[PDB]
């Protein structure tokens, strides 16, 4: 189902894209897994811990 959804969205079925280094402009030698993750900001802040 994930591969079918990727095919529908005109994206690689492996989920890996070709990324280029911003500093040099050179493509990375191997495909890199790129996607979207749900990330959280925990209540452990360096403001309250210094």
Partner 1 sequence: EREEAVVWDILDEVIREHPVLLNRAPTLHRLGIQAFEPVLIEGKAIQLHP
Partner 2 sequence: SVTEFLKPRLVDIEQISTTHAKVTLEPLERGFGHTLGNALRRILLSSMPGCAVTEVEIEGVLHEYSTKEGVQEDILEILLNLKGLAVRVAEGKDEVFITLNKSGSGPVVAGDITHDGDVEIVNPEHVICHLTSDNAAIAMRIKVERGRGYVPASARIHERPIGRLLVDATFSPVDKIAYSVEAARVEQRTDLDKLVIDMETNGTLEPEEAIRRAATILAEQLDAFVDLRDV
Partner 3 sequence: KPLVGTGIERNVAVDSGVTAVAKRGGVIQSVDASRIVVKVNEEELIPGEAGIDIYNLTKYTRSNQNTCINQRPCVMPGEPVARGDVLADGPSTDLGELA
Q: Which does 50 bind (CB under 5 to 8 A by kind): partner 3, partner 2, partner 1, none?
A: partner 1
Query: Restricting to residues 17-46, which ones interact with partner 2 according to CB under 8 A?
Result: 22-25
- Look up residue 28 and give its two tokens: 């990375």
Phi, psi of 20 (to 5 degrees): -115, 140
CA 40 to chain centre: 16
**Using rule CB under 8 A, residue 49 touches partner 2:** no
Where on the chain is the footprint of partner 2 (CB under 8 A)?
22-25
Where on the chain is the footprint of partner 3 (CB under 8 A)?
36, 38, 43
């Amino acid at each position: 189902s994930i591969k079918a959804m990727l095919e529908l969205a005109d994206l690689p079925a492996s989920g890996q894209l070709t990324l280029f280094d911003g500093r040099t402009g050179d493509a990375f030698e191997r495909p890199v897994t790129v996607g979207y993750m749900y990330m959280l900001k925990l209540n452990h802040l360096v403001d309250d811990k210094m």
